[PDB]
Design an enzyme around this catalytic site. Structure first.
Site, PDB file in Angstrom:
ATOM      1  N   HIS A 144      43.785  42.262  64.833  1.00 41.55           N
ATOM      2  CA  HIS A 144      44.668  43.402  64.601  1.00 41.55           C
ATOM      3  C   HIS A 144      45.475  43.234  63.320  1.00 41.55           C
ATOM      4  CE1 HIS A 144      47.465  40.580  66.527  1.00 41.55           C
ATOM      5  NE2 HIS A 144      48.430  41.275  65.952  1.00 41.55           N
ATOM      6  N   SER A 153      51.983  36.905  64.845  1.00 44.11           N
ATOM      7  CA  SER A 153      50.706  36.819  65.536  1.00 44.11           C
ATOM      8  C   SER A 153      49.840  35.725  64.921  1.00 44.11           C
ATOM      9  CB  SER A 153      49.974  38.160  65.477  1.00 44.11           C
ATOM     10  OG  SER A 153      50.551  39.092  66.373  1.00 44.11           O
ATOM     11  N   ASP A 196      40.192  40.342  70.397  1.00 40.39           N
ATOM     12  CA  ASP A 196      41.090  40.653  69.287  1.00 40.39           C
ATOM     13  C   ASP A 196      41.191  39.477  68.318  1.00 40.39           C
ATOM     14  OD1 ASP A 196      42.641  42.504  67.914  1.00 40.39           O
ATOM     15  OD2 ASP A 196      44.457  42.138  69.078  1.00 40.39           O
TER      16      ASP A 196
END
Lengths: 153, 52, 153, 153
Positions: free
Chosen positions: D30, D104, D52
């Site tokens: 992402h 992240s 992801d």
């Protein structure tokens, strides 16, 4: 001046000094080269040839770190990387021999860290050197002030 | 008749192109000083006229 | 040597060295890689393939300060990056284990700071390692010296 | 963590982190950006879209110097770049307020220097913040643990 005035590089030589003011980058048209910053290399430069300049919009990250526009210019001494510049009778002058080629685009600085004019060239009149520059106006008009005999550095 | 129609079409095209070029150059001339300065308190007649 | 000898980089690894002598930039042919410098990147390289070299005219802004060369070759020790090369019997030797791949193109300097030869490779003869280089001559001639069992570094 | 964790650039801003574990480099899908390392830019990434993530085979000169993996996860406090993370009830949680967008792909380390999980997002419950991460199992199964309301950072 050192932190937020980016030279333009070309063939291993500095040709000028592009300046980021008021959230927009400006670079004199008469000079040619490439900008060292990677971010500034991706900006679209709209060309105002009548003022010998091109301008573009800086990205979001760098908008907050820019020098400050101005309109009020009392006559007197103003800061410059090469020293002090004398403003009188609506004209900018420097001691004879200071500055030269490769210095175009250098912003003249005020006492409060604010930009007054951008150096485009200099004409040698014997005693001093009259600076051909672009200055602001009370109505927000960018007047290109160039004394006779000016040479674009 | 074909020659006359082609000439008329060319005249219309070149006239429109010239008018557009002159309007855009007028926009450049009368807008670029105000785009290099803060707080462009512009009378909106010029922008409204030549924006379309 | 540190100032005016430029590594050659390929894929993030240093694999060769290009040298400036007498106002001209030489690079060797066996090693492949870019030159980080803009001007040298813009130089047209005339390639002598049997000489395993390419020479190109150095730009003007750095021709003034360039390595000086020489043709007189008295035998003895000659300084270089990882120590000294012993010159004897018309041959350059270095001790076993010094040098290797990626050191090609390194100039051999004189005591008076002058280039005498450029190393291209080395051959292992057990006791020492014999350097295959490009020596010069008094009569305006350049001779490549290589041994039996050459290994271009 | 500082040495072996790299930043990902999005127009010149940090927006994530790419982690090298056991000779393979993982990066969240992402988060969009360019890996800072020049070597890793040439590494082909194969993507687990449902996880992801994208993983690739790291080059030969970094695979040993890597964040060693582990599978044993007793509940308690574990290391983290921003401090300590509590693993309780099979859930990773942090104090509410620390962490956010751009974190992240941050690796979570062990006391002995091993990696336990990689952060992908977080959801604020008001008292604490539960981190949607990927956790490993004894049978070698990587479950993407995402608490309800998880938002990828």
């Amino acid at each position: 001046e050192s932190d937020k005035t980016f030279p333009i590089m070309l063939n291993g030589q500095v040709n000028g000094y592009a300046c980021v003011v008021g959230g927009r980058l400006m670079k004199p048209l008469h000079v040619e080269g490439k900008i060292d910053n990677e971010q500034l290399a991706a900006v679209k430069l709209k060309k105002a040839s009548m003022y010998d300049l091109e301008y573009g919009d800086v990205p979001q990250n760098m908008k907050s770190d820019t020098l400050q526009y101005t309109s009020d210019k009392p006559p007197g001494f103003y800061n410059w990387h090469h020293g002090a510049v004398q403003y009188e009778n609506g004209r900018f002058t420097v001691p004879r021999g200071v500055g030269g080629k490769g210095d175009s685009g250098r912003p003249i600085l005020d006492n409060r860290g604010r930009v007054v004019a951008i150096v485009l060239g200099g004409a040698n009149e014997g005693t001093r050197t009259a600076l051909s520059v672009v200055t602001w106006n009370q109505k927000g008009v960018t007047i290109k002030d160039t004394p006779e005999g000016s040479e674009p550095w | 008749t074909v020659i006359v129609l082609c000439g008329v079409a060319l005249a219309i095209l070149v006239g429109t192109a010239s008018s557009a070029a002159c309007i855009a150059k007028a926009r450049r001339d009368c807008l670029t000083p105000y785009a290099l300065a803060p707080n462009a308190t512009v009378p909106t007649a010029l922008a409204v006229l030549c924006c379309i």
